[PDB]
Amino acid sequence: VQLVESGGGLVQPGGSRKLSCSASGFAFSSFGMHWVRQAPEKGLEWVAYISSGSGTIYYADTVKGRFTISRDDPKNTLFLQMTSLRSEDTAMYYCVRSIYYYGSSPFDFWGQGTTLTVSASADIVMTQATSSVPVTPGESVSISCRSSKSLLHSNGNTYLYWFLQRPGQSPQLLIYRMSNLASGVPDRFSGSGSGTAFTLTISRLEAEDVGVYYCMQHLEYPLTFGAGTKLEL
Amino acid sequence: SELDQLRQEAEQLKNQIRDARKACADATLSQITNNIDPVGRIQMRTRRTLRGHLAKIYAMHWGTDSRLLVSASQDGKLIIWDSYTTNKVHAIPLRSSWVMTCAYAPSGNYVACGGLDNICSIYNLKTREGNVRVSRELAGHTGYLSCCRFLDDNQIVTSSGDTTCALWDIETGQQTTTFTGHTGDVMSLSLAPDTRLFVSGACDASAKLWDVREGMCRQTFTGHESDINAICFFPNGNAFATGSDDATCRLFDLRADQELMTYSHDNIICGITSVSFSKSGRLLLAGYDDFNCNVWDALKADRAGVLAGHDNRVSCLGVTDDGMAVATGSWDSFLKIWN
Amino acid sequence: SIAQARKLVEQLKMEANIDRIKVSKAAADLMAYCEAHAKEDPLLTPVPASENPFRE
Amino acid sequence: MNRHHLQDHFLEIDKKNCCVFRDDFIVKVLPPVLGLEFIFGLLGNGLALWIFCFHLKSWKSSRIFLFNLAVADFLLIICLPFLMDNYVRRWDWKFGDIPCRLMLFMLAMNRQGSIIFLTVVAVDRYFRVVHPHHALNKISNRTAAIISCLLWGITIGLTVHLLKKKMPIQNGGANLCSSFSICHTFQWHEAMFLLEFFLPLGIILFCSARIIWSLRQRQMDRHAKIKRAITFIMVVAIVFVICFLPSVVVRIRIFWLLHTSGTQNCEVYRSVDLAFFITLSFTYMNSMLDPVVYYFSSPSFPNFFSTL
Amino acid sequence: LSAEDKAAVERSKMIDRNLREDGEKAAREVKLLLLGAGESGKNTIVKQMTGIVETHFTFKDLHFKMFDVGAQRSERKKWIHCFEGVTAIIFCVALSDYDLVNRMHASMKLFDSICNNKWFTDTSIILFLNKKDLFEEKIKKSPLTICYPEYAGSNTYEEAAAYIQCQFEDLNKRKDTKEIYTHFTCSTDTKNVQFVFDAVTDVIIKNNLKDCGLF
Ligand SMILES: CCCCCn1c(=O)[nH]c(=O)c2[nH]c(Cl)nc21
């Protein structure tokens, strides 16, 4: 499973570029795609989502209409076309795969991403309690966050995901639906919540856990993201 | 010794078995169960109906979570059904379309398939690529596969159409233990709750209990007069019910070593295709060749209720682990949920 | 060869050793569990649609 | 009276030379025949519709077209008693303009739709027999429903023009109610009436001949049901001909009488219109005989009738 | 209402569309069942075109599916019902079996069992009498009356073959519903497949007429 992306560079404001990604090692057609952007200093932010059947295409409010997302299942390649991009668009874009079914693990794999540089309401808000917390090996730290609207759906599933951005690499999913650990994640990770207040527990902290932890809500679009909490060793 | 002497010895042992069986016949189930109140009329409705399949359905199995079920049909597709929402979680394109059995792993990671083709196919539902593919092809059997049941994520026991029943290892894909006690075709299997013993029904009207580890026959029951199509374990694991084409169902007890009660009726002249028990074991739901399903009280042996929501043969009959609902497949290509 | 029948004879001998219990007590041991769990069975006693996870 | 009673026969509906007659044999013949036809068609269509609601699972394109034909026949027989009431009063429409407009439009639409649907059924049988493999391309139930809706739309469109005309013209205490008026011009309605028999008759004959050849070349001797199907297929065309042809013949006679005895003079042409109306009664006779010929043909329909 | 279950519903709808396409493809294909004692005759029949063996061949823009059940060696009563939907059944019996050890009687018993089966009430049977060339010499050497004491007629290929054909045909109790298409074949070139195609087309015509209600 690999996701190679290209189409970065430096462009003056008002230009247009078409980001492209090549998907290999997995069934691209069966997996829905997502686009997420990293500001140089801010946190991740969702961009667009195209489903497996190329339908139900959604765009974030800040990019609605201006950007379009298309896919070519026979070619196993994804194209994101940007038109009349502004200065606020300067960010590093990641492509994220997703599959939707009972027991699924959406946003499990994240691409490396590409750098993009430009020369000079009605959504759930992730209110992260803390932006940075010191940690030491062998210690335990709890990360908590606030949500404007409870994510506890009538079906009993709360739409809360956790992501870890180690320095120099893309985010990795750790817990999805606050009760299931992603494949390859050590069992020491654990999460719990009451539907509006959430806490992430990391027992037996290991040096590989250094990074910035980001949250996700999937109850209603757009998939707004939190500020991000950075742990320093 | 000479063959006639061996036959005389076998007859003497059979007479001894008869004497032992009669000695334990203290009373019949009817007179002892007369003290309990009748279950009464049981009314069930088709909360959910599944129309995904396009051919005749033949086997199905409920998952441990009591949410997902796997169904098999001759169209060559295995569909994982979300009972609450009727969504199709997966659709497995079977290599061989002649499938008459299927199973669901206790952990839900793997499923089983089999039928006319002797090869058994195991599929990985939780693969990284996201597309279900064949894990192993167990082709050690010579006859047509009849039933399959998961003992664990690494061990599976399947009964073939030949006289031999085999226990398979997923890690190595070889027959760890082979059971050859049955003389005729083996139709269906049923794992005990403790996953230590299992009963196998055969077309020679003989039901035999097998030891998974020891690997030899432990008990034999011969109360039926025809082929035993279906068999299922009692929830407590100390008894099992047998379905046969002779339009009668018999409940056997492992301790008594004899049938306790017979479920039969005059109008019911058709055979039995599937049998299952409720969580508490009070209700015995058994399929029938006619266009209906009958609910039998395991204790009083009376028709508690009838499910007439089918127009063809009721091939399979599955009950959730928690007893929340009952699924009844049939040849009409429609799977219905009753509760 | 008679070893095949000797195995069956040995298995019968093992069978005879079971310490059996009266069927009446064996049957009664099944009762007293349904009555205690009578309210725990969603099928024996009707379940309100509000608490039922199958309501439309 | 000037020119005897001919001064009243001449009517000038919208064009000249309209010549509906008065005081003739129609009263003695038409009402009883219309009543018997209405009763028979009513009971037959009722039973057909009642059993049509019992085989949804086996409900397919051929049965879709058959049900459409049943609906058309039921509508026509339901419209029959209005014509019976008109004929007992002998061309005096008691009801208003809108009821007459609706009755004429429904009559035309229903008869044309019935003919179209039976022609399509014959075409379907021809496709199934002569081209068994090609027939599998049309089993789509949704496609069959769309085709039936399109056929209904065409039938309505060719007959809707009857609505846009103030019909109930009055003659001597009797309010005429007829679309056929022996006009002095080739009004499109009669040309449509003629083609509605010319084209479907040829299509039915071609399909029946092809089915006859294909079945008799390869399977006739094998088993009797083939003989039964052949006989009933021939009977369908025979009934269609012997019932619809007389109307076409009398109307062709009327058109051929474009020079004299149909225009510029009357009182010697009464018999032509008199027989034309009996031919229309025969068309209704065929309309009500359609479900006996079609629905009771299948060996399963007797079983359904016995069960109900 | 749904928030993420809508994606699951869309996936289910796509799966249903794929299932419908596969069902249409399966319905277009015609299914044939192969039966008969002796592997040699069935092998010859297959060439003239571990459990179930499936052979796929297209003739005149029609895809034919043939199923092999001889290798199973199991009780038919438990799996014969799986072949309810077969449009036609091909039965292969070698005419030379009459002199080998009784085999013709076994073939007749199998044909009687298959033809009178409740599941195959409305399925036609195609009877292929294999090894006509060997039968030519066997008649000249061994008389036909060995296995048929009631037989009484000229010892010629025509008469003996006709007698065998009638003997096999009379076993069909359901003469009104079933139709047996007997044929002679040893090494026919592009003649056997024509016969099987014609029989399958006649069966398709019968099924279509039954569906339309005329039958
Ligand atoms: C097809 C045009 C509408 C109906 C025309 N029509 C008919 O076709 N047969 C009649 O007997 C009749 N009587 C009256 Cl009044 N109109 C009649």
XYZ file of C-alpha atoms in Angstrom, chain B residues 141-320:
180
model
C -11.401 -34.316 0.648
C -12.621 -36.650 -2.094
C -16.402 -36.238 -1.822
C -18.587 -33.164 -2.063
C -18.355 -30.842 0.924
C -21.526 -30.835 3.023
C -20.947 -28.575 6.038
C -18.260 -26.414 7.629
C -17.856 -24.925 11.103
C -15.107 -22.772 12.602
C -13.488 -24.037 15.799
C -11.080 -21.079 15.969
C -9.131 -18.678 13.759
C -6.690 -21.502 12.911
C -8.801 -24.697 13.059
C -11.866 -25.626 11.000
C -13.864 -28.870 10.910
C -15.760 -29.824 7.751
C -17.876 -32.828 6.770
C -17.652 -34.127 3.204
C -19.969 -36.215 1.058
C -17.709 -39.255 1.420
C -17.595 -41.477 4.515
C -14.771 -39.424 6.084
C -14.951 -36.242 8.161
C -11.769 -34.188 8.464
C -10.341 -31.569 10.814
C -8.193 -28.961 9.074
C -5.439 -26.582 10.181
C -5.427 -23.130 8.595
C -1.738 -22.572 9.354
C -0.611 -25.674 7.434
C -3.708 -26.567 5.399
C -3.554 -30.296 6.159
C -5.926 -32.812 7.730
C -4.740 -32.984 11.337
C -7.398 -35.570 12.236
C -9.688 -37.656 10.021
C -12.911 -39.279 11.242
C -14.032 -42.405 9.360
C -16.711 -43.786 11.685
C -19.704 -42.940 9.504
C -20.612 -45.459 6.804
C -22.820 -43.233 4.639
C -22.860 -39.634 3.484
C -22.326 -37.020 6.209
C -24.734 -34.092 5.857
C -24.317 -31.535 8.654
C -22.135 -30.754 11.663
C -22.615 -28.811 14.892
C -19.926 -27.548 17.266
C -20.500 -27.617 21.006
C -20.392 -24.344 22.975
C -17.120 -25.444 24.602
C -15.625 -26.233 21.159
C -14.412 -29.632 22.385
C -16.930 -32.108 20.904
C -19.137 -32.122 17.818
C -21.934 -34.324 16.472
C -22.217 -35.318 12.809
C -25.399 -36.398 11.048
C -25.176 -38.974 8.271
C -27.494 -40.372 5.611
C -27.370 -43.833 7.240
C -29.726 -42.662 10.026
C -26.798 -42.632 12.476
C -25.683 -39.729 14.674
C -22.186 -40.046 16.145
C -20.332 -37.837 18.620
C -16.704 -37.052 17.780
C -13.816 -35.802 19.909
C -11.903 -32.926 18.324
C -8.661 -33.705 20.176
C -8.904 -37.458 20.793
C -10.318 -38.036 17.312
C -12.507 -41.122 17.818
C -16.210 -41.847 18.158
C -17.562 -41.388 21.681
C -21.279 -42.146 21.248
C -23.668 -43.347 18.551
C -27.407 -42.710 18.199
C -29.646 -44.564 15.734
C -33.168 -43.345 16.501
C -33.950 -42.137 12.977
C -35.362 -44.212 10.120
C -33.935 -42.108 7.266
C -31.114 -39.736 6.355
C -30.304 -37.023 8.907
C -30.064 -33.772 6.946
C -29.522 -31.345 9.842
C -28.090 -31.396 13.362
C -27.550 -28.721 16.000
C -26.205 -28.608 19.547
C -28.267 -27.663 22.570
C -27.228 -24.295 24.058
C -25.950 -26.054 27.191
C -23.984 -28.535 25.059
C -25.367 -31.723 26.647
C -27.938 -32.490 23.928
C -28.605 -32.094 20.218
C -31.543 -32.274 17.812
C -31.566 -34.230 14.546
C -33.528 -33.403 11.400
C -34.338 -36.103 8.863
C -36.325 -36.592 5.666
C -38.803 -38.859 7.506
C -40.731 -35.785 8.756
C -39.642 -36.221 12.387
C -37.162 -34.470 14.684
C -35.506 -36.285 17.589
C -33.699 -34.816 20.596
C -30.738 -36.855 21.849
C -29.043 -36.500 25.239
C -25.344 -37.283 25.595
C -25.733 -38.600 29.169
C -28.854 -40.721 28.607
C -27.406 -42.027 25.309
C -30.918 -42.257 23.830
C -33.622 -40.096 22.291
C -35.730 -38.171 24.806
C -38.660 -36.992 22.666
C -39.872 -37.062 19.061
C -41.310 -34.073 17.192
C -43.695 -35.238 14.461
C -47.250 -34.663 13.284
C -49.718 -36.168 10.836
C -50.018 -33.292 8.350
C -46.232 -32.850 8.336
C -45.112 -35.492 5.834
C -42.170 -33.533 4.393
C -38.502 -33.765 5.302
C -36.436 -31.467 7.502
C -33.736 -29.293 5.926
C -32.334 -27.309 8.876
C -32.618 -27.254 12.667
C -31.590 -24.660 15.239
C -32.083 -23.818 18.909
C -32.868 -20.576 20.710
C -30.536 -19.036 23.287
C -32.460 -20.578 26.195
C -33.144 -23.815 24.300
C -36.886 -23.677 24.987
C -37.746 -23.150 21.302
C -36.554 -25.489 18.537
C -36.885 -23.934 15.073
C -36.640 -26.516 12.283
C -36.978 -26.059 8.546
C -39.312 -28.115 6.387
C -39.661 -28.815 2.682
C -43.108 -27.202 2.582
C -43.440 -23.430 2.284
C -43.276 -22.750 6.029
C -41.078 -23.025 9.115
C -42.319 -24.627 12.338
C -41.267 -23.620 15.858
C -41.196 -26.607 18.224
C -41.056 -26.447 22.015
C -38.030 -28.570 22.903
C -39.604 -29.641 26.209
C -43.311 -30.195 25.504
C -42.746 -31.043 21.808
C -45.601 -28.929 20.428
C -45.919 -26.540 17.489
C -45.422 -23.211 19.251
C -45.639 -21.247 16.002
C -45.393 -21.376 12.223
C -43.483 -18.990 9.939
C -45.192 -18.943 6.527
C -43.191 -16.079 5.028
C -41.600 -18.308 2.386
C -42.906 -19.791 -0.861
C -40.171 -22.405 -1.433
C -38.043 -24.861 0.532
C -36.534 -23.535 3.776
C -32.926 -24.593 3.201
C -31.283 -23.021 6.261
C -32.342 -21.716 9.666
C -30.010 -19.591 11.790
C -30.488 -18.138 15.269
C -28.482 -15.277 16.741
